[PDB]
């Protein structure tokens, strides 16, 4: 009855950030200290909760969102940030309660010749709202001339692919990210630390 964090953190495949994955966690016991100590993470940043307090708390639901971005973009996975990732792909709310966890995945997600499997949204008419997901792929009209289905200058396919090459600098290497959000509603709190 331990929470299935292994299925999230140790997943063989991770989503593209524009099509980010969400798993709901419920009705289970979670040791967050064990999680914290389970690997050499490069980011483990909590908001409104703390690593030292989580094992004494109960929540109605935990959501685990996961995806790949490049190293220099992990700083955008935080409340109050701007940039292509925060604005167009994955947005946290200002009042976020949870933890942002990341690790370098260059050994899995780069490839000689480039790994092109991971995508992000490069253009959007307006910013995302918090926890919004946009998987659309219609041509983006970047100027005032209508595109009429024809791509070219000022008429763009809206996604770009990372081109993860093993020799990239670390800021441009792939990082796997898990965002844990802790929700407390007027409902039974079924996700608890071992101290309960």
């Amino acid at each position: 009855n331990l929470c299935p964090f292994g299925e999230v953190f140790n997943a063989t495949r991770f989503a593209s950030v524009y099509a980010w994955n969400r798993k709901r966690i419920s009705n289970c016991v979670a040791d967050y200290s064990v999680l914290y100590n389970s690997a050499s993470f490069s980011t483990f940043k909590c908001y409104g909760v703390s690593p030292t307090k989580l094992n004494d708390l109960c929540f109605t639901n935990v959501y685990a969102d996961s995806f790949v971005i490049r190293g220099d973009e992990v700083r955008q996975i935080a409340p109050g940030q701007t940039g292509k990732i925060a604005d167009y792909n994955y947005k946290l709310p200002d009042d976020f309660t949870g933890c942002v966890i990341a690790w370098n995945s260059n050994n899995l997600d780069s490839k000689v010749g480039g790994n092109y499997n991971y995508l992000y949204r490069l253009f959007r008419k307006s910013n995302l709202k918090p926890f919004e997901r946009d998987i659309s792929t219609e041509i983006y009209q970047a100027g005032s001339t209508p595109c009429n289905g024809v791509e070219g200058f000022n008429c763009y396919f809206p996604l770009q692919s990372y081109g993860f090459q093993p020799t990239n600098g670390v800021g441009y290497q792939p990082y796997r990210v898990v965002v844990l959000s802790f929700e407390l509603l007027h409902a039974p709190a079924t996700v608890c630390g071992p101290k309960k």
Partner: nanobody, 118 residues
Framework: SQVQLQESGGGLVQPGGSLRLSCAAS????????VGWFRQAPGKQRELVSR???????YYADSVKGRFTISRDNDETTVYLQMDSLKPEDTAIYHC???????????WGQGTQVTVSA
């Protein structure tokens, strides 16, 4: 940040013939997640002929749909444009390019010449 896009594969063929263009990228750093093949006929506007983003999001201009195929090399930062069933109006200098931020980059090299002549 430096990139060189080496364009090759053009030639002189008869109508109905085929060519494979190659856009081979090298350098310390470049964004190869989107690659576009452009062409400019004499005294005409440059147009995007075909684009590939990621592994499998492709675009073809109406006039080449069904005749051209864009693809990636499996082991190298190279993209190919297979041009089949060539027509005289495909005659142009073909250029490949990549994105820099939210726009096609300012790279505009020597390209490769395609001539289709009856």
């Amino acid at each position: 940040s430096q990139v060189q896009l080496q364009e090759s594969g053009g030639g002189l063929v008869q109508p109905g013939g085929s060519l494979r263009l190659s856009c081979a990228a090298s350098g310390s750093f470049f964004e190869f997640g989107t690659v576009g093949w452009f062409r400019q006929a004499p005294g005409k506007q440059r147009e995007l002929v075909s684009r590939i983003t990621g592994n499998d999001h492709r675009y073809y201009a109406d006039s080449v749909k069904g005749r051209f195929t864009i693809s990636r090399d499996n082991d190298e930062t190279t993209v190919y444009l297979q041009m089949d069933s060539l027509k005289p109006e495909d005659t142009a200098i073909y250029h490949c390019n990549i994105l820099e931020g939210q726009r096609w980059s300012n790279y505009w090299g020597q390209g490769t010449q395609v001539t289709v002549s009856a």
